[PDB]
Amino acid sequence: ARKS
Amino acid sequence: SESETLNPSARIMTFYPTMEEFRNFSRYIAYIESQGAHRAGLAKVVPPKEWKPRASYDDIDDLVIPAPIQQLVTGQSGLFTQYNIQKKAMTVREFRKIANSDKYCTPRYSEFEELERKYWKNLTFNPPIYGADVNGTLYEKHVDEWNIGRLRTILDLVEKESGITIEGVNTPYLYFGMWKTSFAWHTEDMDLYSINYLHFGEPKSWYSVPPEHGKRLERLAKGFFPGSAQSCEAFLRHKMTLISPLMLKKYGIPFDKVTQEAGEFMITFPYGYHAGFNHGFNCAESTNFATRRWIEYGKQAVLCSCRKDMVKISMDVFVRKFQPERYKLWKAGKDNTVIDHTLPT
Ligand SMILES: O=C(O)CCC(=O)C(=O)O
Ligand code: NI
Ligand SMILES: [Zn+2]
């Protein structure tokens, strides 16, 4: 979904 | 074997391209791999002095950092777990004031060795705030060389084929650091490459473990955190685990260190474990990228298994386009290819  | 002779100590290499060499990103990445740079997991690229991504950074005070994180660190004896407490949105102006305040600013020190000791001594105290994961670029629109927002690598096939945007992976992130803000031991999502440019401010220090020894680091980590290992197949992807260089030495894990200064690029390579910290108020920009040599890493990357929100890129498009011989074999679960971490292409 996204880089964190 | 020719690849095995190059950078045999797997030490972090530093490159100084001319402007001509600098213009072709994918070409230059291929060049630094021909010199064995990927063996370290990390390389520094110092761009030509005549190159600049932005005229000045004097117009950004009002830029919003929507999700700053306070970094609470727990542990001792070179082994730590970092917990992220999200704070309310703040502007770069509000952040820089905090960063330079008496409470949060860089301690006085002589050599980096002294500052590194202070980092490892104090990292569980006075939890700092990291302006991490801000969607955006500070590159000017016209800049064609090493533009983190449009590197034009084969990672572009993800969006091209599926329309899928993955923030920070195929789009850029900004990171506003202050003293003692940290990034835990990790490889990239899908074991991709990353690029990190330090726009301005105090240095960012890096540790790296050769991809050739990545599995040894995992074995140690799993031993240091048996609970986390049982819960997830790739717990280091939580990016919560900090391990000091002295701990790595004690257990014979090879690693190297480098300090990135303002104006310099760091490149991380597939399956290259890295961790680090900021020296003081700074700002970095980064994203992921791919090359053909990444494809096998992407195919074999071991992903976090306890969160339904982790990054998972479909490999199908890459295997079809760049490995047609092996597609049917791979789809049928019979592709037993073994990665050689030394080899280019
Ligand atoms: O600069 C940061 O906070 C993270 C950097 C990083 O994880 C990377 O460059 O791969
Ligand atoms: Ni990284
Ligand atoms: Zn997990």
Q: Which two tokens stand for residue B282?
A: 């700074």
Q: How far apart are CA B191 and CA B269, in angstroms?
A: 8
- Does B189 contact A1 at a Cβ distance shorter than 8 Å? no
Q: Do B287 and B226 touch, CB atoms closer than 8 A?
A: no
Q: Do B110 and B97 touch, CB atoms closer than 8 A?
A: no
Tell me the domains of chain B and their CATH numbers: 12-345 (2.60.120.650)
Query: Count of residues for chain B?
Result: 345
A contacts of B309 (beta carbons < 8 Å): 1
Q: How many CB atoms lie within 10 A of CB B311?
A: 21
Q: Which two tokens stand for residue B327?
A: 């597609």
Which residues make Cβ contacts (< 8 Å) with residue B77, sequence separation at least 6?
A: B247
Q: Do B154 and B318 touch, CB atoms closer than 8 A?
A: yes
β-strand partners of B84: B71
Q: Which two tokens stand for residue B342?
A: 């030394």
Q: How far apart are CA B276 and CA B84, in angstroms?
A: 16
Q: Which two tokens stand for residue B311?
A: 């990054």
Q: How far apart are CA B178 and CA B96, in angstroms?
A: 8
The approach used to solve this structure was: X-ray
Choose among B196, B191, B210: nearest CA to B318.
Answer: B191
β-strand partners of B70: B85, B129
Interface of B with A in 308-337 (CB under 8 A): 309-311
Q: How far apart are CA B229 and CA B225, in angstroms?
A: 6
Q: How far apart are CA B129 and CA B240, in angstroms?
A: 15
Nearest CA to ligand 1 atom 4: B183
Q: Which helix (H) or strand (E) holds B99?
A: helix B92-100
Choose among B269, B289, B272, B286: nearest CA to B344.
Answer: B269
Choose among B226, B229, B289: nearest CA to B29.
Answer: B289
Q: How far apart are CA B19 and CA B122, in angstroms?
A: 41
Smallest CA–CA distance, residue B133 to chain A, in Å, is 7
Q: How far apart are CA B140 and CA B150, in angstroms?
A: 12
From start to end of chain B, where are the E strands? 13-15, 42-45, 64-65, 69-76, 79-86, 90-91, 129-135, 173-177, 182-186, 193-201, 204-209, 241-243, 256-260, 265-268, 273-278, 282-289
Tokens 């717990």, residue located = B235
Q: Which two tokens stand for residue B153?
A: 């690598």
Choose among B63, B205, B193, B88: nearest CA to B138.
Answer: B63
Gap from CA of B183 to ligand 2 centroid (Å): 8
Q: How far apart are CA B225 and CA B212, in angstroms?
A: 22
Nearest CA to ligand 1 atom 9: B196
Q: How many CB atoms lie within 10 A of CB B326?
A: 16
Q: Which two tokens stand for residue B141?
A: 């629109």
Which residues make Cβ contacts (< 8 Å) with residue B218, sequence separation at least 6?
A: B236
Q: Do B314 and B162 touch, CB atoms closer than 8 A?
A: yes
Nearest CA to ligand 1 atom 10: B194
Query: Count of residues for chain A?
Result: 4
Of the residues B42, B133, B175, which should be mutated to test ligand 1's pocket, given the most ligand atoms within 8 Å of the CB?
B175
Choose among B109, B104, B107: nearest CA to B128.
Answer: B104
Residue B130 Cα: closest atom of ligand 1: 3
Residue type present at position B314: S
β-strand partners of B208: B256, B274
